[PDB]
Write a protein that binds this ligand. Structure first.
Ligand SMILES: NC(=O)c1ccc[n+]([C@@H]2O[C@H](COP(=O)([O-])OP(=O)(O)OC[C@H]3O[C@@H](n4cnc5c(N)ncnc54)[C@H](OP(=O)(O)O)[C@@H]3O)[C@@H](O)[C@H]2O)c1
Ligand SMILES: NC(=O)c1ccc[n+]([C@@H]2O[C@H](COP(=O)([O-])OP(=O)(O)OC[C@H]3O[C@@H](n4cnc5c(N)ncnc54)[C@H](OP(=O)(O)O)[C@@H]3O)[C@@H](O)[C@H]2O)c1
Ligand SMILES: NC(=O)c1ccc[n+]([C@@H]2O[C@H](COP(=O)([O-])OP(=O)(O)OC[C@H]3O[C@@H](n4cnc5c(N)ncnc54)[C@H](OP(=O)(O)O)[C@@H]3O)[C@@H](O)[C@H]2O)c1
Ligand SMILES: NC(=O)c1ccc[n+]([C@@H]2O[C@H](COP(=O)([O-])OP(=O)(O)OC[C@H]3O[C@@H](n4cnc5c(N)ncnc54)[C@H](OP(=O)(O)O)[C@@H]3O)[C@@H](O)[C@H]2O)c1
Ligand SMILES: COc1ccc2c(c1)c(CC(=O)O)c(C)n2C(=O)c1ccc(Cl)cc1
Ligand SMILES: COc1ccc2c(c1)c(CC(=O)O)c(C)n2C(=O)c1ccc(Cl)cc1
Ligand SMILES: COc1ccc2c(c1)c(CC(=O)O)c(C)n2C(=O)c1ccc(Cl)cc1
Ligand SMILES: COc1ccc2c(c1)c(CC(=O)O)c(C)n2C(=O)c1ccc(Cl)cc1
Lengths: 329, 329, 329, 328
């Protein structure tokens, strides 16, 4: 009896996604069964991983993704109308759930921050920065950390956790606007990797001593240069490689194995969902407390309208976003 | 006084080394001074690293390398005539030393094994396999381990230590004679990577479940294929990358970061000389005991004549060697 | 005074252009000076060369390009109101010109054909096909000509001029619709290069004798295969290499010089603007006359709306266009 | 009669190695009508053999040309003592029927070595002659880039360019070769192996660019040269020796943006395209220029048929200054 809107993949991406690769559909959801609830999207997220996972989708399928939603119709006594939850039905305005696949927000979640932070700094990207930096990289204080995409959802949290842990932070971003923003946040050195005369010279001057840690979101040639300036036994958290997600040809060369061996680098990739239970719960509480204390400032790149969700995904891949990209329903 | 012969790098290598890139030179060493000794090479080693480190030499320099030598003339009572030592004067038949840079063999070294094992299984390559497998890969027992160059000095020791730790071993070699030899040693699966119809399908049949560990001596496209079949949380010891040492053009593409990230691989490069003191002495003794007890079989590829040292170096780069490549003086 | 709209390059392209790389800007043009005129764009062209030339622009500059325009205000007696001219002010709807850089259409230009053909078959792309085939390739009749992008502006004119000169034409295109269209036109063989089981096998069956001429618009691996089937002393007109314009990494391998040398191939690149004066005028008249006689059928891929000019440029790079891509103001 | 023959034991992997060749001694049959027995005096080794050996079956004889003399004859047109060019491969003695033999120039004097018939006054000299004068189309005054400029073909290219009034920028692989070509008078000569940047070196050697490019090397080297060709510049694609011994994929191709913008003309060629009167005219011109001192000849002589594999391998690695020749 209820209607919904859903973004589906009409055509597989070639290079960057385009508007014609998506198709909006209006359908009628089935009636609720006993124990089910109807969820209305309040905020939806778009994330770089969707560019990679989309290739395993079939044409006509719904784009994957998480959202903050509220119950608008309930046949479940535990989930009354008004309940806020995180759910991953994909790019859709309304969806059916039985309760098992839903996640309530932290009990201490205050009204002083937008619910949309549950998809960002106090959500999956913030957890990625938390464990990638503190556990994979293992910063203990005083290290020099290189982080790229430093003005995005993950990188901005990485740099600010590093600063509050007593580290020096060198950040790479793709616009002068992002450089200014992170400078205001207090990052030690920030530069626009698109306009540097020499990426090697820039990284050398940013830290003549080398780099203890590298939180890598970009991959590709950029990371080959960073590897040449890691300290011996330096540590790389392989978080992402967004410079390759939209590639049409072969991957770029790897770093010269001469340098990798001499540098005896430890390089570990990770997926945020590895951490669950009490470890995950504790990381969310730390992130919430740091936001409320101002040690982590949040900024959101809000795109208004479900109909503009493809445009938000496409823009984020191209760096339009300063901070977590969010679609307000 | 005494005469000597020395192999020098006449020209920097372009692709594989050739005879024209080396020049034998005969010089007269000065008489011995107080505290000096004259060393006569008994066995000299050639190793893949020399292909890469030679680029940092100047044309005319002596090729670098280690050797087992004996004192044949002494003005140093602490190093009497007949003393056996390890020394790294380069590709030379005779050399003068004062003692500081000389390393005696293990005191328990028996006459039942060749002195040349101090350059191989009970030497630098054996230590490389030892720490690369037990620490960097961190084998606990029961893992499925992929080792390439599995019939070489390091790789053959890797597979044999893995077998006595209870691991399944999948070895890749370059000739049918190497396939047969390692099968007789007991390696679970061994194949000739040069003649298999498809490296990917071969690795899948050798272990449909994937690979817990990857001892990587080869790098390049081969490692790209192995990475597509690593188990989640799989560990890679980046030991060498010999598939690139003789390249004329750019490095090959890197591994797909999509697989590296989702499988959350740990990948650490290492240099054998990192381990010193009691850990190194303890590893040498473990290797020596394993040899005498038959747990580690040794095979040497002996090339006779100092004048054939370039041919041994080139042949080993071409895969001629079954076991440690050694030049008998 | 008069208002105008201008497409600017907001960001340098990384891979394929995206909407985020362009910015529409509204300006107020200054008053006309004596001898100047105000031009209103009727049709604008987008062309592959713009993907490569944009690299030399500064961010904020106007995208380069040609257009058919009409004088809407004149202080120039030679250019009264209503005059149609070709002009190259870039991607702009209104512009000021002093007349020197303007080109009137052929005096015999009839009302029976679209004005936009002055940007295509009876314009710059038609001149590229004309001189590239008749002069650089030097077809005299009876040759077998391989042309790729055979359904684009240049390639479609190449194949049709080749057919009317008595040549056999083998065309490569990127869709089955383009295969069907060119087969109907009378091209001897046409195939979809994206779906062939083996590019070499397809080209061998299309002409077991080889290829006398190769009009190359694509470059890359495709041309490596074509070179492997050129007749001895075959001629290649290097017109474009669009398969590399949107690359993120290094160029692909070159053709095997063993084949290029033994086949003694003649390869000459050219720019259409080399030909001027009477030679250029003669070609324009030939192209118009062939169009009016039906020997050259024209097709246009029309995108309506100046605001959709970036989308027409991007679509053409992705093969959306059958025939010359044109933006109707 | 007995003979000695070098055969391809194993197909090459990278550069040829000593083990890839096998010397075989066989007994030739007696002569029939019109047949002669040839004794090799000089044999040539050439870069093309590295590539043509890929079409051989293992056990076959290595291909190649040689100067030979008739030591036994049943052909009146070819008496004992006659000098001829023959291509029986790497063999000390061979039987021929006369059809495939070529007499030397009739005016060939005793003042020059016979072995020049395999070099400056032979196939490599003809390659430089037609490659430069026809494919590059030198008329005089051009700035000419020639690599392998101290080899058989490249040294003749640079000297024909000098006598036509051209500026010559030559690339070689040793300081000895740099000194030899600087002494000959080449305008600019550099060791491409020791420059820190090939682009900088070519930029300063000719800030104006290059009118012509005689290409013996190919690969990355030629990608750099293409970025410095003047508009409408001409490239003679003679060889690509930097790729003959490759084990992996070819390097990237030249940047098409530059090739199109500069409207470059690039034509490959094989020396045997020219025959009859055009070939004869070139041979005469080359002999005249050698006798007049305009083309100096230098040979890299390796003595002994048994060292022919070593001469072929060394030439591929740049040991040779001038044409590599094996003295039987
Ligand atoms: N391992 C995990 O579990 C995990 C979880 C979440 C995210 N990730 C990864 O972390 C990265 C960041 O994700 P996010 O959610 O925070 O997105 P984000 O950084 O907010 O947005 C993507 C950003 O990447 C940059 N970018 C795009 N193309 C680029 C290129 N070619 N070179 C360099 N930078 C480029 C752009 O910023 P500039 O203007 O600075 O270029 C853009 O703003 C992605 O690689 C993603 O896959 C991993
Ligand atoms: N990091 C360290 O401390 C350290 C120390 C010592 C050695 N290493 C490295 O460990 C590796 C083994 O060294 P080693 O002394 O034991 O040499 P080795 O394996 O005894 O000899 C090299 C072997 O590599 C193989 N090979 C050559 N080219 C190859 C290619 N393109 N692809 C695949 N395999 C190829 C050949 O065997 P096939 O018949 O299987 O091709 C050859 O026998 C080298 O990469 C070396 O640099 C590292
Ligand atoms: N030298 C000169 O003076 C001159 C002048 C004008 C144009 N040109 C060149 O000539 C070519 C054609 O230009 P045009 O104006 O006629 O454009 P066009 O062919 O009308 O449009 C470009 C076409 O190229 C094809 N294409 C795109 N990406 C490709 C790829 N990766 N591989 C193969 N084909 C691809 C697409 O058709 P498919 O469906 O077949 O992919 C597309 O329709 C371009 O290379 C251009 O630079 C040269
Ligand atoms: N008809 C034809 O098209 C034709 C006929 C004959 C020869 N050729 C070609 O012309 C070239 C020269 O032949 P040639 O008979 O005169 O031989 P050559 O130049 O006397 O000997 C080959 C020379 O090439 C150089 N070389 C080797 N490897 C190299 C590399 N990787 N990069 C750059 N230079 C390298 C060496 O000199 P450096 O010390 O300067 O490196 C070596 O001396 C070859 O490419 C051959 O195939 C073509
Ligand atoms: C990846 O290319 C190289 C280049 C140089 C290398 C190595 C590898 C390795 C490791 C290997 O791959 O064997 C070593 C050990 N190299 C040395 O220069 C060296 C030699 C002796 C000492 Cl004491 C210290 C360092
Ligand atoms: C670049 O190669 C990939 C491919 C797939 C990936 C990721 C990275 C990452 C990590 C990232 O880069 O954000 C994630 C999370 N991928 C998922 O498929 C996924 C999607 C939804 C869920 Cl619930 C769980 C997993
Ligand atoms: C680089 O790949 C090759 C392959 C074959 C080649 C050549 C080059 C060259 C030129 C060179 O590079 O020297 C020649 C002359 N090839 C011959 O097969 C040949 C032999 C005899 C005659 Cl009559 C005609 C041609
Ligand atoms: C792929 O590398 C390039 C880069 C720039 C190019 C071209 C090709 C071509 C040819 C082509 O289309 O391939 C042209 C014409 N370029 C121009 O910049 C240009 C010059 C003058 C005018 Cl009036 C208009 C455009």
């Amino acid at each position: 009896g209820s209607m919904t809107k859903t973004w589906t993949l009409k055509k597989h991406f070639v290079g960057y996604p385009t508007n014609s690769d998506f198709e909006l559909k209006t359908s009628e959801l089935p009636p609720l069964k006993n124990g089910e609830v109807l969820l209305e999207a309040l905020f939806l997220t778009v994330d770089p991983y969707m560019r990679v996972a989309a290739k395993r989708l079939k044409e006509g399928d719904t784009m994957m993704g998480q959202q903050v939603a509220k119950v608008v119709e309930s046949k479940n006594v535990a989930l009354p109308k008004g309940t806020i939850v995180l759910a991953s039905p994909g790019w859709t305005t309304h969806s059916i759930s039985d309760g098992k696949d839903l996640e309530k927000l932290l009990t201490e979640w205050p009204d002083t921050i937008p619910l949309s932070l549950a998809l960002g700094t106090v959500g999956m990207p913030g957890l990625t920065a938390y464990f990638g930096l503190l556990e994979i990289c293992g910063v203990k204080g005083g290290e020099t950390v290189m982080v790229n995409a430093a003005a995005g959802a993950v990188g901005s949290v990485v740099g600010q956790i590093a600063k509050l842990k007593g580290c020096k932070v060198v950040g790479a971003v793709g616009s002068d606007e992002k450089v200014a923003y992170l400078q205001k946040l207090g990052f030690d050195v920030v530069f626009n990797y698109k306009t540097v005369e020499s990426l090697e010279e820039t990284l050398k001057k940013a830290s003549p001593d080398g780099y203890d840690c590298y939180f890598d979101n970009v991959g590709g040639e950029f990371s080959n240069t960073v590897i040449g300036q890691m300290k011996k036994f330096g540590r790389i958290a392989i978080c992402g490689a967004i410079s390759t997600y939209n590639r049409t040809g072969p991957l770029p060369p790897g770093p010269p194995p001469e340098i990798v061996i001499y540098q005896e680098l430890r390089m570990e990739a990770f997926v945020v969902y590895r951490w669950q239970g009490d470890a995950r719960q504790k990381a969310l509480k730390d992130l919430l407390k740091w936001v409320l204390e101002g040690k982590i400032q949040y900024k959101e790149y809000i795109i208004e309208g479900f109909e503009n969700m493809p445009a938000a995904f496409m823009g984020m891949l191209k760096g339009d976003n300063l901070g977590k990209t969010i679609v307000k329903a």
